[PDB]
Amino acid sequence: GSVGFSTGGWEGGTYFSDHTVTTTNTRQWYTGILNGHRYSKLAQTTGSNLQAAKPWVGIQTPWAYLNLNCYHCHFSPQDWQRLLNEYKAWRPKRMHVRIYNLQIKQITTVGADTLYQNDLTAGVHIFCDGSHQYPYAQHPWDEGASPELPNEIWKLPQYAYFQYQGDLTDHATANTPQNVESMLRSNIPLFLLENSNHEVLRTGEMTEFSFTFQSGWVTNDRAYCCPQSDFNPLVQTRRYYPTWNGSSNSYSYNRYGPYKKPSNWMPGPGLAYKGATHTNQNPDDARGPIVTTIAPRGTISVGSTPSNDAPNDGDNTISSDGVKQGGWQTAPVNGACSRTDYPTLAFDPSDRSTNQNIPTRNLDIDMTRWYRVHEPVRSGNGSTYYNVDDVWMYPNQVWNSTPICRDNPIWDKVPRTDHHTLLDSSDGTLPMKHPPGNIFIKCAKIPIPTSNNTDSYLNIYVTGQVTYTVEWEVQRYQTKNWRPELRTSAGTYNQHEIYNIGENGTYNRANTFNECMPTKCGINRVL
Amino acid sequence: GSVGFSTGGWEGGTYFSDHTVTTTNTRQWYTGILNGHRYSKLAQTTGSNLQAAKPWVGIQTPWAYLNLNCYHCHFSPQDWQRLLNEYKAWRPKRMHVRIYNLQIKQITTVGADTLYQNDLTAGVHIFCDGSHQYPYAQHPWDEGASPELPNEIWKLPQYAYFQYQGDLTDHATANTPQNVESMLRSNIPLFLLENSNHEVLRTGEMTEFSFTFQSGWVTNDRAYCCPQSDFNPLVQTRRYYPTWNGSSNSYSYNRYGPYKKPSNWMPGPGLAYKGATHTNQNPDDARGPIVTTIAPRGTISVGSTPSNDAPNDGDNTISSDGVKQGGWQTAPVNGACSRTDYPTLAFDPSDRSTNQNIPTRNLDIDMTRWYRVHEPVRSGNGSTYYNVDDVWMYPNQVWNSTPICRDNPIWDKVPRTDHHTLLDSSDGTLPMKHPPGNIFIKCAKIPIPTSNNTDSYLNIYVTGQVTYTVEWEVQRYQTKNWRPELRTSAGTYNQHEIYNIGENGTYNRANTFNECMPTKCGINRVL
Amino acid sequence: TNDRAYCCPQSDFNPLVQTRRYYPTWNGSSNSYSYNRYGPYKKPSNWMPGPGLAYKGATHTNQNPDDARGPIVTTIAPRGTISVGSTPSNDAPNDGDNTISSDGVKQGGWQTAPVNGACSRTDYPTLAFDPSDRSTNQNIPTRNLDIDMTRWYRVHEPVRSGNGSTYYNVDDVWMYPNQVWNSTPICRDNPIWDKVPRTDHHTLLD
Amino acid sequence: YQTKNWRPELRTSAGTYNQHEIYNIGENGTYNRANTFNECMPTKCGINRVL
Amino acid sequence: LTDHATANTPQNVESMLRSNIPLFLLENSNHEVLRTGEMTEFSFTFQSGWVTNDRAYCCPQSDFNPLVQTRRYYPTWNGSSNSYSYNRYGPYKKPSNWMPGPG
Amino acid sequence: GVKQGGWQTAPVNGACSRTDYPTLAFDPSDRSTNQNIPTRNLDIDMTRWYRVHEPVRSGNGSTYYNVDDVWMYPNQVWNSTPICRDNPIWDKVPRTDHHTLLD
């Protein structure tokens, strides 16, 4: 008889050790009924009017889901400081999630007054998709992650997923196969969570989930030198550099100076592009820096026209408007270029922020990450130094990843595909094949009798507690550095009261990326 | 199925034996929702206006806590009488606290009428901090301790804690380091009880806590003589006292009279100061007798100005107003001086007292505690007898502690610091490293669905029973005294009906410190 | 000990709860006291500011590095001996004791510094040092930074005087019961230990 | 140390010092030492204890 | 490197770099001190790829058999019809799946 | 600024044999007085490419674009440069979060 028995306590606190950090967090969560207990088409209405449907079309579900992906979910500002000061590297190992102390209440109107009364026999649907049968649909930077403050109520975000690009229209030429658009539309998936197995829980019940991570490392230490400066000037190099003689049409040689020795190591791959920065209008346009247009041959997308003049030769050229609303954008794409760390990653530390100050990633002091790359080419009497904005993958590229802050997402799901290149994120998330599965939650749909076969349900909502524990594998730094180093310190910040509760419970959050306590500031690594 | 089963009975009564007294008390307690389930800045607005913030700034929490610290919590007036009459000494050994028979009710408005209905699935957060991770914030003399009468309802007091002194402002001179105020403000702690582990209980559940005391003794017997009178006049002393001869510029000697023999034993340390008694206005001013101004070099407090004239030499002198609102006061500081027992300890016997008569400690008949101390110094023809208001710690000081009454606090937490001197309280509480930990209680925060992301919770309150049992180590007196002695007796009091229930349930409480049944009145100890 | 106190023991209470304690007010007409509850935002504390002697020493001149400046200067000499700049004084209080001139105390005495104890006001400038031996640096590190909140700036004993009260600065706070304090901060350039002199008695070692 | 403090704290950091090159070897082997007591890295700055 | 402060940059980055420079003194580690009658030795184990002495006499793209026809066709753009027509690759250049290495 | 401020990576020829020369030149020994400087001009391996062209239909004919930068792309296959007795044996891989293929 667990109506009067709790199914759990409250669990909080972090534990530090040499090889392990364990974070434990409990939140009170709730969800009401979403989308009237039904699945429905979700389509974007925004964007400049064009003779086509808007690109994103999908399904919004009745379900809600748990999002644990961000560091401020797991670490308090204190704990994050201690992680960054005492450890050169960490990665998540295993996560345990308990859902318990469930309460299901009927929302009742007896009059001008709204009543909240237990329905003791009402259930809650809880489903973890761990085999990734359903669309994951988790953008790492989404709001609706577990709130930073343990005392804050967490309203579950609603689950929706992409279905098809609505902008695609049938296009028939001598250069295309027939009926490709209808072929795409016929093949769109529909995912209903009710054709899978899940648990239904009443108020005296609990459920739990365990996940094991496989990921690379987040690395807190930085390089104080680039690989290319890293030689010894007191020793001469045997290497010579050529000088072209226009008279003899040959080369002569001179020893490289001891203070620049040619390196075998390439600057890491980096794409320095801002994207389209020219206007703030139309938040649903694809700004950049990389915009990808998907469309199969035989279909034509927004603002696309076939072009019969070379190089295109029957391919569809896409106007600015077409690329802008039709395409899908990848940002940041800076890679190893530190010049474009800014302003290509900017975020709110929390959801629904009223702060006018937007933290943007301006601080990278790691010295393997490059500002500019130049290819000098002999031209006439002198040489022309060509800035290279696109440094692609090339052998012997060696670089460090961007710094991250407590407000970054922890992981990003690697799309399941035939092939992928090296996995390094420009935003710093850990790419994971098999990230922890979506934990889906919805109130039971309790029908109300109707004579006319209308869909009428009882108005209820579930609240409960969720405890999530992450075991973090972690490595303490060791150094022979004689000097003291930069450390994350509260005294660095222009906002002295940051992460403190103020008048009327206002909680102070970072104005800047530095106040978000970024990694790779303090600890020197030897290359 | 404990919805219909109680988790405990009612436990009351005291048990006396030779070496042990056991008090058992049960109270019905409740708390509603505090501070709207949130943490917020708590700042004092009172005091004379000054160009600075008011000193005390802190955090008021959603939590409530149990306060067992006072004797009238544990002992009935009868039981206290018997303790003081039959025992020379006692100390608390172990305490057991049970919280049970929990009821959690929703407060509902259906109309002009307010309804109280069980929420059977609602929880209660109960947390004991026994490792003193959170601020203790218990002033021994606070109200909100368990009520004296077993039948009285106990409303849990709300927990709040100090954070920083708001009066401190940055002060930069050649004599100070830079940016100390921002350094203080940056380093202020924030304590959220939800990052620790605690129990959540529904109505069919209970919890219990055990504590072990380490303390010195409360001592009921008194000295009938001072150490300095304690000799035998029928025997001559070999000791001589000097007399200065101004003519020969030397000393001559004469045997001490047998009825004052010089003693090796110093009067105990005592600071005789009233504090600032001149006005009753501004209850938040620091009156005395010892006022401590905290402020680091590089900061400047209220009413402070740097003074470049000696002795100060760049130190900040503080005006009366600055000391008055800015400082922190220590009272009583009488120590072994009985002259300043009055009026330096005065209190209400109970919380929210309407009695105009305020018990103040005027009765100390222990003879080791001194009225005045004089240092005579030869001056001219005679000698000048200098009153000494400050007797500091000196070797061979020997003294008895102040008497206490049933309305005193039992213990006081020793602040955790690098160093402390001898622990003797002028108010009589037992200093304890590791006093019993705060038991924190709050109603679960049960969210109400809102579309606009406002914070809206279900209005509930918890009531329960708390049983607390203290085992007291105790010592019976033994004496060869031939004569009968003073004993605590109901017939001593001008109020004959004291501790009786009167018309309409009015409970009579002590008008005077004597009616509070003070210790160290009755039993003679041999020195 | 590396950790610090962010509050003094005397601020450390809960203002949301009233105190049962009252403070006296003297009535000169009735020659008695009346009582009023302490305000919830200053609750009288059982805990004394730690012992502290706020004295600079003799700061007036830089000459004569071998003079005993302070803040505590101890003259040793047994009865039957006379030290530098000492003369017997037959006028009270001295009565045959040797009074010592400034010069005598100055070169003859032995100095104890720092003697600030729990007073943070005199942390400066009573501890100043070179980080290394034979330093050429004109900048002398001196201990100006103490943010520990148990260590006190000033102590006042207010005493009712006439119509108002006089607030007496206390430069000497001696050992007294229920004093609780944290030790001074140290730096990487401090000595680790000091040998306790072997003696019959010593007080608390801080 | 162990703390339940929610907030980050002061820590000893090289970036605090007006002398940026402190404890570094300079020209001709000159070793840079603290000008101030803060540059000597004093204790009891960072960690909060609960009383 | 010199400090540069604009609306587009964070503050005090140069001093931040200069403050964080390492200093390495070999005397804070453990090493051997040897007098004239003493010796010391060290062992190392390599992990590496191979140095390769043999060469390719052909590129991967020439490496086919001309006596066999390829089924593959190559496009030719017709500007009049705006479409492609196809012709079998000649047996002596067969399109290769293998790209020239990065250079 | 680029010239004195930057740090240079050479050789970066990769699989291009055209730029084997003159991008690697050295003395065989230290403090050489020899005016003749060995420079790597001899690569007869046939997987290593001289030029790469992307032809693009332009007007009536096609334009053959020389490609001086061939980046990493799938199905690139190549042999490493020849080495001589005077080359270094190894190079320390910088310790970093990421590296591409090591050649």
Author numbering:
A (entry chain A), B (entry chain E): 41 to 567
C (entry chain F): 259 to 464
D (entry chain F): 517 to 567
E (entry chain G): 208 to 310
F (entry chain G): 362 to 464
Give sentences copied directly from the paper behind this entry.
To expand the structural repertoire of determined capsid structures for the diverse Bocaparvovirus genus, viruses infecting dogs (CnMV), pigs (PBoV1), and rats (RBoV) were selected. The ORFs of these viruses coding for the major capsid protein VP2 were cloned into the pFastBac1 plasmid to enable the production of the virus-like particles (VLPs), using the Bac-to-Bac expression system in insect Sf9 cells. In the icosahedral capsid, the 60 VPs assemble via two-, three-, and fivefold symmetry-related VP interactions, resulting in pores at the fivefold symmetry axes, protrusions surrounding the threefold axes, and depressions at the twofold axes.
